[PDB]
């Protein structure tokens, strides 16, 4: 089958800039049967281009496609606010139809450090036998960060889950939650609960913490 790969994985660009997205095929895509889609959360992909360079009906002029063989390009000549989304290439030259893994186009803004907060588990929850401790990283950019849990200076692994909001529509920041889940037994066997955050906007990692009380 034809394997499609897209590059880059993420484009960070300002509104109004041009975006150039690449699609490479593992072998030749005959007759340029290549399509591009835009995808937004909770929505089915929206066909932009087919036959490598033909706009679907009602698609704005600023979306244009080119390429042939094993190399294709989607150009978005001007990024409107509604254009920051995920973009996928698809070949329909040989069965099975295959899809690329997507290129995310996000809004570039100035680097913003996260505000970090830590929340102990509530009395209510412990009574259920489980304890969740939440670390919040609020309104940061770019998206990348490192978040380590330390319990009595012990680096924790395998027991925490992360989640990240979509880029904020007003200020183009991201927020992140890391939730460390353990039983009540394992909770009150320990004293120091700390969240350590490394981010480009910070001169050195910030740690927020509490002692279980």
């Amino acid at each position: 089958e034809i394997v499609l790969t897209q590059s880059p994985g993420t484009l960070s660009l300002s509104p109004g800039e041009r975006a150039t997205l690449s699609c490479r095929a593992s072998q030749s895509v005959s007759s340029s049967y290549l399509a591009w889609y835009q995808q937004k959360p909770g929505q089915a992909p929206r066909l932009l281009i087919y036959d490598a360079s033909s706009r679907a009906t009602g698609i704005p002029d600023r979306f244009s496609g080119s390429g042939s063989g094993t190399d294709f390009t989607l150009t978005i000549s001007r990024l409107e606010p509604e254009d920051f989304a995920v973009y996928y290439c698809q070949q329909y030259s040989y069965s099975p139809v295959t899809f690329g893994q997507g290129t995310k186009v996000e809004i570039k803004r100035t680097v913003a450090a996260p505000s970090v907060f830590i929340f102990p588990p509530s009395d209510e929850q412990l009574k259920s036998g489980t304890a969740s401790v939440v670390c919040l990283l609020n309104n940061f950019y770019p998206r990348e960060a490192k978040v380590q849990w330390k319990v009595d200076n012990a680096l924790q692994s395998g027991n925490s889950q992360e989640s990240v909001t979509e880029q904020d529509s007003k200020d183009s920041t991201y927020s992140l939650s890391s939730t460390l889940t353990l039983s009540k037994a394992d909770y009150e066997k320990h004293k120091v609960y700390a969240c350590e955050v490394t981010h480009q906007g910070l001169s050195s990692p910030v740690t927020k913490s509490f002692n279980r009380g």
């Binding site: 830590i118 102990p120 969740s132 609020n138 992360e162 990240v164 909001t165 939730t179 889940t181």
Partner: protein
Amino acid sequence: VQSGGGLVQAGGSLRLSCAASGGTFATSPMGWLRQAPGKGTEFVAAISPSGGDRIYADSVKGRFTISRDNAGYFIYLQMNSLKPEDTAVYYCAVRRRFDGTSYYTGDYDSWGQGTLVTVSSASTKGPSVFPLAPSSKSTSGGTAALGCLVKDYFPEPVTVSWNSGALTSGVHTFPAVLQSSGLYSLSSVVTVPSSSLGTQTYICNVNHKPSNTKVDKRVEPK
């Protein structure tokens, strides 16, 4: 060489198999280990060369059975009453060292093979809603954060709002993530002025329609 994994629903059963890719581990004690997604290796079960002693992780004791044949071609793991917690990549291994107990994963040797086993929850369940108490006192200055932890529900989605729609700016409702229990969990948080805390009421309105679970929870200091 392995087989017998895949997708099954909570309350299903699978029987993984471990075929000798060289003819005989008939005289060697054998074990099954698993590595859950985003997790490390953990012991599952083991069995002595004769098939006499049989040993089981606490988490699977009662439900899983390890067994073998006499020619040392096949070791099995019968997995009954499957939980979402059992979702993992499983592999058998030959106990080639004796650095401690038969529970010690470090004594067992494998060769990179695995079988993926996934257990998909089914029931309609409403969430528990816990408060994320404000991060500073109402006497401190700057910005305070608080929220609601909306935990252990299935399926998607839940709706979360603050003060039935009165508070929206500063709100971040995180995408639901599937816990290891096959139930979703998310937090909704909001930032507010510290000075304001004691003079306003912050309540998340969680509504899980699939179960007509609809909870409102006051979030206050500890």
